[PDB]
Structure formats: C-alpha cells, structure tokens
Amino acid sequence: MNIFEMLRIDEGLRLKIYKDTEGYYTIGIGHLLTKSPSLNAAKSELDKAIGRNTNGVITKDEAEKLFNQDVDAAVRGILRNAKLKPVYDSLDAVRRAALINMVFQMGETGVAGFTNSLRMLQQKRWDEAACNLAKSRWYNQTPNRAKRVITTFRTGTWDAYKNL
Ligand SMILES: *SCC1=C(c2ccccc2)C(C)(C)N(O)C1(C)C
Ligand SMILES: [Cl-]
Numbered sequence: 552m553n554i555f556e557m558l559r560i561d562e563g564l565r566l567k568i569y570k571d572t573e574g575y576y577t578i579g580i581g582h583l584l585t586k587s588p589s590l591n592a593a594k595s596e597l598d599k600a601i602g603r604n605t606n607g608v609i610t611k612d613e614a615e616k617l618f619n620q621d622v623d624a625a626v627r628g629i630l631r632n633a634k635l636k637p638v639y640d641s642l643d644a645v646r647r648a649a650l651i652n653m654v655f656q657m658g659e660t661g662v663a664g665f666t667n668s669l670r671m672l673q674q675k676r677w678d679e680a681a682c683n684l685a686k687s688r689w690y691n692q693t694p695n696r697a698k699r700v701i702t703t704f705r706t707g708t709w710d711a712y713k714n715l
C-alpha cells in the first residue's frame with residue numbers, strides 16, 4: 552500500500568464524466584472538474600486538463616496522468632500551508648498518506664481549518680485525534696471512507712486498506 556493505491560481505492564476509476572459524492576462533475580480517479588452544475592462547463596475543464604477535445608471520455612492512461620498531478624498538487628498544498636506543513640512534517644509516512652488523502656478529498660484550506668484535530672495529530676494523541684476527526688461533516692457524509700482514513704491516523708498501519 553501507498554498513497555496512490557489508497558486513493559485509487561477511495562476514489563475508484565471511471566473513464567466518463569460522472570457525479571461524485573457531492574454531486575460534482577468528476578472523471579478518472581477522483582479528478583474534480585468543476586462545482587458548476589453545467590455539464591458543458593465540466594467538459595470544457597476536461598478538454599483543458601487533457602489538452603484535447605474529449606467529449607467527456609478519457610483513457611486509463613489519461614486518468615492516471617491527472618491522478619498523478621492531483622496527488623502531487625495535494626502534497627504541494629500541504630507543504631505551502633502554514634498550518635498543514637508542521638503536522639505533515641511531524642508524521643510517519645503512513646500517517647502522511649492519511650493527511651494527503653484528506654487534502655485530496657476536501658482541499659488544502661478545508662483540512663487546514665481542522666485546528667483541534669491537527670493539534671491532536673501534532674501531539675501524537677492518536678485515539679483522541681481519531682475521535683475528534685469523526686465529529687465532522689466529512690465523517691457524516693462519507694463515513695466508510697472517513698473510517699478508513701481515521702484508522703490509518705489512529706494506528707499508523709494500512710489495516711483499513713488490506714482486503715480492498
Ligand atoms: S472526541 C474526544 C473525546 C474523548 C476521547 C476519545 C479517545 C481518546 C481520548 C479522548 C472522550 C474522553 C471520550 N470525550 O468525551 C471526548 C472529549 C468527546
Ligand atoms: Cl469518486
């Protein structure tokens with residue numbers, strides 16, 4: 552297991568534009584296209600992202616290319632953020648992946664605002680952090696995925712992704 556395999560499990564793989572858990576147009580491995588309710592706006596974003604006229608369909612190679620960029624973007628987001636970087640730097644590689652996962656799903660500023668959870672993670676209060684993270688819109692709207700991510704922070708193991 553690693554961040555790529557982890558997010559591949561959590562985001563799935565679809566080659567046609569579809570609506571994500573929030574109802575937003577997405578493609579590939581959780582590549583969010585736009586929050587706009589316009590399918591044409593989503594198609595425009597996709598064509599721009601891929602560099603060709605796709606009409607809402609991409610190849611597996613193209614999906615993986617966007618995925619690599621998005622994972623890279625999540626890491627860069629963490630490193631440039633004054634709140635996220637110290638927590639990230641303080642963690643082992645398994646827990647770093649859990650933080651990247653959160654950033655990928657909710658964005659840099661989204662995770663950066665979880666002040667109390669971040670403090671508990673920084674302090675290595677793993678059970679407390681885990682309990683605190685569950686007190687969130689995130690956990691309530693995507694509980695199975697949140698449970699996996701939280702287990703990763705609680706244990707520092709890949710146990711939640713083993714038989715997946
Ligand atoms: S969500 C954090 C809370 C608790 C806790 C859970 C696991 C480890 C440490 C603390 C506790 C004590 C059950 N609780 O009532 C909190 C503050 C809601
Ligand atoms: Cl998804």
Ligand SMILES: [Cl-]
Pocket residue numbers: 675676677678679680
């Ligand atoms: Cl704890």
Ligand SMILES: [Cl-]
Pocket residue numbers: 685686687688
């Ligand atoms: Cl809550």
Ligand SMILES: [Cl-]
Pocket residue numbers: 692693694695696697
């Ligand atoms: Cl879920």
